[PDB]
Amino acid sequence: GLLCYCRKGHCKRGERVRXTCGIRFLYCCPRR
Numbered sequence: 001g002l003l004c005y006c007r008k009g010h011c012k013r014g015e016r017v018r019x020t021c022g023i024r025f026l027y028c029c030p031r032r
Contacts, residue, residue: 004029 004022005011011028021027 002029 002018004018004027006025007015007028008022008024010024011017011026012030013029014031015028016031017026018029019027
């Protein structure tokens with residue numbers, strides 16, 4: 001859907017977890 005970042009460990013401050021992108025990675029989408 002939206003361009004989100006596969007964040008390893010955790011997302012950045014302000015990014016919302018949209019799901020996961022792997023064992024080490026979370027799928028985090030930016031707030032802006």
